[PDB]
Write an enzyme that holds these catalytic residues in place. Sequence first.
Site, PDB file in Angstrom:
ATOM      1  N   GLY A 186       0.795  -1.235   0.000  1.00  0.00           N
ATOM      2  CA  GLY A 186       0.000   0.000   0.000  1.00  0.00           C
ATOM      3  C   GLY A 186       0.823   1.278   0.000  1.00  0.00           C
ATOM      4  O   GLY A 186       1.839   1.365  -0.687  1.00  0.00           O
ATOM      5  N   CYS A 236      20.656  10.854 -33.654  1.00  0.00           N
ATOM      6  CA  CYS A 236      20.742  10.673 -32.234  1.00  0.00           C
ATOM      7  C   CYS A 236      21.869   9.687 -32.008  1.00  0.00           C
ATOM      8  O   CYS A 236      21.894   8.664 -32.669  1.00  0.00           O
ATOM      9  CB  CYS A 236      19.426  10.203 -31.610  1.00  0.00           C
ATOM     10  N   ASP A 294      33.287   8.606  11.888  1.00  0.00           N
ATOM     11  CA  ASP A 294      32.262   9.236  11.020  1.00  0.00           C
ATOM     12  C   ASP A 294      31.540   8.343  10.012  1.00  0.00           C
ATOM     13  O   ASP A 294      30.414   8.652   9.617  1.00  0.00           O
ATOM     14  CB  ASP A 294      32.879  10.397  10.216  1.00  0.00           C
ATOM     15  N   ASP A 295      32.185   7.250   9.607  1.00  0.00           N
ATOM     16  CA  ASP A 295      31.753   6.450   8.458  1.00  0.00           C
ATOM     17  C   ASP A 295      30.656   5.424   8.726  1.00  0.00           C
ATOM     18  O   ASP A 295      30.030   4.948   7.792  1.00  0.00           O
ATOM     19  CB  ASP A 295      32.992   5.814   7.832  1.00  0.00           C
ATOM     20  N   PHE A 305      10.706  -2.943 -37.022  1.00  0.00           N
ATOM     21  CA  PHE A 305       9.722  -1.870 -36.969  1.00  0.00           C
ATOM     22  C   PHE A 305       8.856  -1.748 -38.221  1.00  0.00           C
ATOM     23  O   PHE A 305       7.739  -1.212 -38.151  1.00  0.00           O
ATOM     24  CB  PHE A 305      10.446  -0.518 -36.673  1.00  0.00           C
TER      25      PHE A 305
END
Length: 1034
Positions: free
Chosen positions: A45, A674, A127-128, A388
């Site tokens: 959900g 392209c 810190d890591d 195509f």
Amino acid sequence: REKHYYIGITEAVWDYASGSEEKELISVDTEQSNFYLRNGPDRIGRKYKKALYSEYTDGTFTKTIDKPAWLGLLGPVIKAEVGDKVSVHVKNFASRPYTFHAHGVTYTKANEGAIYPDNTTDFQRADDKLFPGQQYLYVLRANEPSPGEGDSNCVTRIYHSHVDAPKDIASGLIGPLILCKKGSLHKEKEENIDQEFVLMFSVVDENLSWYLEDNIKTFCSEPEKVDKDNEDFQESNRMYSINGYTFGSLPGLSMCAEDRVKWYLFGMGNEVDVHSALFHGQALTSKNYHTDIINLFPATLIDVSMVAQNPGVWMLSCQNLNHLKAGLQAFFQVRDCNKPSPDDDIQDRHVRHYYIAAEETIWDYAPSGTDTFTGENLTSLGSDSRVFFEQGATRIGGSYKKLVYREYTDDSFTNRKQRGPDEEHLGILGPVIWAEVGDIIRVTFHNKGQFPLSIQPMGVRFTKENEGTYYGPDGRSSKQASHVAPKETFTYEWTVPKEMGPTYADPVCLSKMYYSGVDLTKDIFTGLIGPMKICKKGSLLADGRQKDVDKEFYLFATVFDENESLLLDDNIRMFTTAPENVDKEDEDFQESNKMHSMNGFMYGNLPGLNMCLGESIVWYLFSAGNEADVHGIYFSGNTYLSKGERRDTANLFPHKSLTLLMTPDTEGSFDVECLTTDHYTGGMKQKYTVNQCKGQFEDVTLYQGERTYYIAAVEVEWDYSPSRDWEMELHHLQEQNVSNAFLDKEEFFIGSKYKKVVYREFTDSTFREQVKRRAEEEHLGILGPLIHADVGDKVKVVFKNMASRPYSIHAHGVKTKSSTVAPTLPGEVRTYIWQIPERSGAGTEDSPCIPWAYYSTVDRVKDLYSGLIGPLIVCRKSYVKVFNPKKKMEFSLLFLVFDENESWYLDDNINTYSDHPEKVNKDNEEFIESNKMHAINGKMFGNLQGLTMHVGDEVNWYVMAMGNEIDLHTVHFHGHSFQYKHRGIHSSDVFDLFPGTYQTLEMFPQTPGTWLLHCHVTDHIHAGMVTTYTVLPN
Ligand SMILES: *[C@@H]1O[C@H](CO)[C@@H](O)[C@H](O)[C@H]1NC(C)=O
Ligand SMILES: [Ca+2]
Ligand SMILES: [Cu+2]
Ligand SMILES: [Cu+2]
Ligand SMILES: [Cu+2]
Ligand SMILES: [Cu+2]
Ligand SMILES: [Cu+2]
Ligand SMILES: [Cu+2]
Ligand SMILES: [Cu+2]
Ligand SMILES: [Cu+2]
Ligand SMILES: [Cu+2]
Ligand code: NA
Ligand code: NA
């Protein structure tokens, strides 16, 4: 100025859709929202257990500072000014280790909050990783170039956890850090700014969250048939949101008309995170250029400014059509606070009236039935085109019933305004709607189709009664403008106020577009799309052509998804010989209806891109679609200018548009194509023609210096990961085992070694000695040698093909004598001549040196992936003034997923490397994935070495991308920001790259250490597109 923030990490249940509907959204029904939002037996959900950052008053973490309502799940806003020291006290109250890691900003190795192999020890790895109950004080200083002189007063940076950054972010540990110029803040808010909003566009992936199992346990009422591999289930855990609010639920984006607003935007996530933010009805700028769409990718950082106009409720949506229908939409409210209109002003306003119908054609995507580049029949056996164009039993072919915008002379829709020779290239596009700043545009739209339609402009001003897209509640009763039924007519009125026009710094005319907004996600693909051109006052002639410009061309690039067309059913009936057997859900039927095109034309069939040598040309490029629409439109043979930068490849995305200026300087027939690998193969490629038109001189173009390079194409055994120590150590530190689909040979996969072909330098024309690579070139990896050139040089590339088939060498940017590039046969040597005129070097706003890819032209796709790629660097001719040295460092990085499935050497590599080649199926999806090598300079997981520099160095990084739809790479350097454009006016620490993007980044290293360098897209980090660079003390 020293500052303190206290920030805590806590698990808590996040609601992605508190708000319901209620809302009337663009292109979404109950089914579509239920998919993502509704609880079920197999489905979680809208509520997920997440780990989130929260703000506290004190070092005790005993009470919260309330987040603004619109921040949603993002961590609290940190602000820093140049010179500030910022202390971030962080404490982790969740059930696993986490960190705080900041982008904008300077930290030592002890203050980074990220774990990886960095030769650090103990006093420095604290810190890591912050275990449950642990606490750390992160010391940040705003000391890099921070915001550049050309950047806004305040810019967007981010912070997030970085144990396993992608999983931690998906879990919810991400927030904003707004970095500002000294001292633009008052009471933590930018002076003279009325509203500051921060928005993250993200497909938040709950399959990647640490809390996926916890969330299956809590919400799936039967935890049985849930295969976590189940595609429909994974997708239902992808929440297409802004600040973690989906389906119009983002609260609190209110403002007053005339408010000066800053929007701090960023993208986050994975390869599907191709975003196109549209603020409907508003007028935006970024870096003093007009913007209509804001594109955002994983960790893209940008800031935009706007003056809120037009009192009402307005939509904020992603125009990635897949994202839009998955709920990525929000509302904002512009109230009438009676603040004074700067009431303008404009004289001699014109009415531009257009008569436009939507109507049916049979659109043939390639009228000649051939690929014009090769002369081949489109349906010829084994060709890529056949997929195509094949027509038969369950296959439509090359022609589709479409719905198209078409211009008429009048309100009777009787006589077409016939399309001139200038407008033949338009193809499928509707007529150009053009106007000057100040004008009124009227469009009388008559629908001759069988589906309701509309006209929705992007980037002009409409009242609510004229808006082409329906949503609410926003106080509209009438549907007339947003729903023009099958025989009706509606007259739109839009206006063009100056905020919607070009800025001072912009070109004379901006490219925009219009489309049908009744159902955006189908209408455009049905064919209802056209260009809009909006121009400076006084700039157009009576017919709309721009004054000092010989020709204007419009190129719309897209993957026309005929599966999404309103007419898919008519076309199945009209064109298949067996419509009963068509399964619309079949992947191969789907693929066959994806027409990769430019103005509706494919495989070189686009007519009318014809011009004269030396003419002044303006190109207006744009796109629409979804995450598949990542385009690099490459003009071979010429460069263009845009915003003072020189390029030859324009990157497009959904709803993006660009204006490019070109003065072509060589005669011939050239490619506009392209570069994106799948698109080129799929037919997105065309010709443009440059003709002499008179004469006259024999030999007049720029050569002074001569440089000669001896380069060969050599077949070589390439290892993407010769060690696995970096990878294995990373994983030890993260405390994760995890296999590797790319490197593990398993039963019968190839592994990390592949026969490739690569460019390598030689010492002279005998080709008997390969140039020995220096220490400062070790980092090049698969890249060919650096070719350097100055403006005014001629470069002689003496090329020997020492490999098993024909290849070539050609460069972007460079000028040549003709449009054809000769192949070099095996064992042949051939001289290629690259002229380096002014138009092949920096534009006025480029840094002095700019990079261009060189590559082979025989088979653009397969030669790239087989390994042939390198950097040409072109520098402005050396100034006459200089007295002393400086000490300049150069690194070239190529971000590319090497698809070894497309290598010419795939069969050899199957036979050479798998334990059992008999077992190999090339169409098997897991095998295909095993050969996608996600690399920097052809190396993975820290095997890219030699990126070493010293504090005080001046470093140019030449970054490049090439490849496929999937090759979106967002380059992030830990430990330092960089600058770009002339004089380093802009600053960032994430640079967005796509196929054909090339950029110089200047860096001034000042913090010692060994620092992570990686693409910021999830799939790519996990797959190995990462290394380090090392900054040593002076
Ligand atoms: C392509 O090939 C087929 C033969 O299978 C033929 O019917 C068709 O007309 C050819 N078209 C062109 C344009 O050459
Ligand atoms: Ca550290
Ligand atoms: Cu990051
Ligand atoms: Cu999006
Ligand atoms: Cu606009
Ligand atoms: Cu493309
Ligand atoms: Cu494709
Ligand atoms: Cu990447
Ligand atoms: Cu970082
Ligand atoms: Cu990182
Ligand atoms: Cu991948
Ligand atoms: Na489940
Ligand atoms: Na869900």
